[PDB]
Amino acid sequence: GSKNLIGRHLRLGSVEEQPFMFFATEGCEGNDCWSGMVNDMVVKLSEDLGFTYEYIQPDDRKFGALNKTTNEWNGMIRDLLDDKTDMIAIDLSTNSARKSAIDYSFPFMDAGIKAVVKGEGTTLNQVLELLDQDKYKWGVIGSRHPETLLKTHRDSRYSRLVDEGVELKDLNHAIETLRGGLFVFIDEGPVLAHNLISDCDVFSVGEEFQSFEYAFGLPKDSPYKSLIDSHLLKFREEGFIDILWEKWSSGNSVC
Amino acid sequence: LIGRHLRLGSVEEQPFMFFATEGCEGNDCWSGMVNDMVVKLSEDLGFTYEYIQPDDRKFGALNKTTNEWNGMIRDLLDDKTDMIAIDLSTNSARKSAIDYSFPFMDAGIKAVVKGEGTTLNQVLELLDQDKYKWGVIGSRHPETLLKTHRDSRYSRLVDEGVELKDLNHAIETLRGGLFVFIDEGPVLAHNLISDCDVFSVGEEFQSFEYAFGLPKDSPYKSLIDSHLLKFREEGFIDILWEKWSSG
Numbered sequence: 062g063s064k065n066l067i068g069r070h071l072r073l074g075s076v077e078e079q080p081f082m083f084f085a086t087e088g089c090e091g092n093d094c095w096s097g098m099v100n101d102m103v104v105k106l107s108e109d110l111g112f113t114y115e116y117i118q119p120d121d122r123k124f125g126a127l128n129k130t131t132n133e134w135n136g137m138i139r140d141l142l143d144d145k146t147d148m149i150a151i152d153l154s155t156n157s158a159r160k161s162a163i164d165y166s167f168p169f170m171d172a173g174i175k176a177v178v179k180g181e182g183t184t185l186n187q188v189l190e191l192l193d194q195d196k197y198k199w200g201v202i203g204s205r206h207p208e209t210l211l212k213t214h215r216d217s218r219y220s221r222l223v224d225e226g227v228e229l230k231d232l233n234h235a236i237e238t239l240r241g242g243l244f245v246f247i248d249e250g251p252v253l254a255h256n257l258i259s260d261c262d263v264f265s266v267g268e269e270f271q272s273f274e275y276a277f278g279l280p281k282d283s284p285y286k287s288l289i290d291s292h293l294l295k296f297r298e299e300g301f302i303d304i305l306w307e308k309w310s311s312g313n314s315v316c
Numbered sequence: 317l318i319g320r321h322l323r324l325g326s327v328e329e330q331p332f333m334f335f336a337t338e339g340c341e342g343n344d345c346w347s348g349m350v351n352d353m354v355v356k357l358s359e360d361l362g363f364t365y366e367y368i369q370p371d372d373r374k375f376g377a378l379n380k381t382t383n384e385w386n387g388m389i390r391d392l393l394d395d396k397t398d399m400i401a402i403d404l405s406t407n408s409a410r411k412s413a414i415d416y417s418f419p420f421m422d423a424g425i426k427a428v429v430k431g432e433g434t435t436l437n438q439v440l441e442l443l444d445q446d447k448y449k450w451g452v453i454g455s456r457h458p459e460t461l462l463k464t465h466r467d468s469r470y471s472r473l474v475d476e477g478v479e480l481k482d483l484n485h486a487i488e489t490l491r492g493g494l495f496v497f498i499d500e501g502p503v504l505a506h507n508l509i510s511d512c513d514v515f516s517v518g519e520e521f522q523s524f525e526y527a528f529g530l531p532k533d534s535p536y537k538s539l540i541d542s543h544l545l546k547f548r549e550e551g552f553i554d555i556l557w558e559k560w561s562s563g
């Protein structure tokens with residue numbers, strides 16, 4: 062109520078995930094190392110709400126999931142829970158596991174799970190077909206939203222997909238493995254759309270499934286949620302989110 | 317929420333809510349996608365509930381002359397209700413007064429007209445002609461978005477168009493011909509499914525959500541948000557849209 066963001070210094074959790082965030086590893090310092098759709102949103106928020114900020118990456122370079130053996134979180138989620146950060150500023154997918162531990166901002170983008178495949182010859186219509194064949198290998202990135210949704214899906218065949226697939230380290234590794242061929246990568250629509258635009262030998266496996274949002278992550282009881290929510294809604298209503306997606310997402314296709 | 321009683325603001329808006337005006341008692345007068353959501357929430361969280369309609373039968377908007385709200389929004393601000401359970405569109409004006417739950421459906425503004433082969437390509441072209449009339453429903457979200465749009469030609473559309481009482485009046489006027497009705501995609505999709513001579517004018521514009529409305533500092537927001545997100549994740553929202561929307 063009384064608290065606002067004027068004069069505050071926010072620590073923002075993030076990682077590279079194009080086109081939401083690009084992180085330069087040399088030739089820059091501090092916030093200047095960061096660019097992308099989410100960075101543009103943060104810059105505007107900082108101008109309008111009067112805060113300064115820095116970005117903090119999790120050492121494990123994970124987005125975050127709950128380990129059912131240890132009951133501990135990792136990734137950006139863990140950094141937020143541990144008060145290393147105040148908000149997670151990225152394409153953070155909405156899922157129930159995360160919601161049990163953190164809050165979400167007003168959302169900025171609808172997204173679904175999308176599976177893609179590289180390979181000549183017989184192909185697949187739906188991801189569960191992977192379980193009854195051995196032509197294609199497949200995988201999801203560990204400690205990231207798609208893995209969590211497949212593991213919590215009430216049809217435990219989706220947990221089989223996760224358990225019997227390759228555990229991929231991060232998006233670069235997943236895309237490298239996909240490009241190696243005879244592989245199905247199961248991830249998120251907007252991420253794949255942007256990053257695989259030139260991969261003319263990569264095709265869809267069925268339709269997108271599951272419905273969720275990208276939002277920012279906020280700790281429970283954050284004094285800043287109301288303001289962030291209001292301002293993100295205004296961004297959406299004013300067309301800013303759409304303008305930034307057009308700015309940053311890849312256009313055309315050589316294909 | 318276990319043991320609690322929630323007063324829920326709502327009105328008829330098919331296929332989200334159907335209200336029977338006779339032949340029923342209490343909660344059983346209501347049905348539809350939103351009712352099915354409320355029933356499941358009630359079972360899972362353990363609250364009882366009733367529905368309360370605003371006397372003015374409006375969704376609600378802020379009158380910039382009086383700086384007062386009407387409709388379901390006003391009933392919530394007046395503490396006549398605890399939550400608004402309907403397809404409540406997200407807009408900044410409402411956000412200045414109330415909170416929203418986690419959303420359950422994307423929606424856009426859509427314009428429609430009767431008669432094949434309309435010559436209109438975009439709604440602002442209406443300002444430069446007088447073959448067609450047009451309008452929006454008063455004290456409802458599309459009116460608010462057009463009035464608050466950066467491009468004040470959208471305010472012109474509202475000010476120079478017909479103020480429609482409600483969805484029935486609007487569809488009636490649409491079906492009467494030579495009239496462009498500007499409203500919300502999902503509502504129009506459902507309610508005009510059988511109108512095979514009604515057509516879109518331009519593309520949908522504006523991006524918003526349907527959510528429930530909550531008073532600021534509600535003690536119930538966290539739980540409602542969590543359970544609505546779980547409904548989306550489990551596929552329940554999509555199953556209900558398939559159940560209720562035509563067809």
Ligand SMILES: [Mg+2]
Binds near residue numbers: 170422
């Ligand atoms: Mg949405």
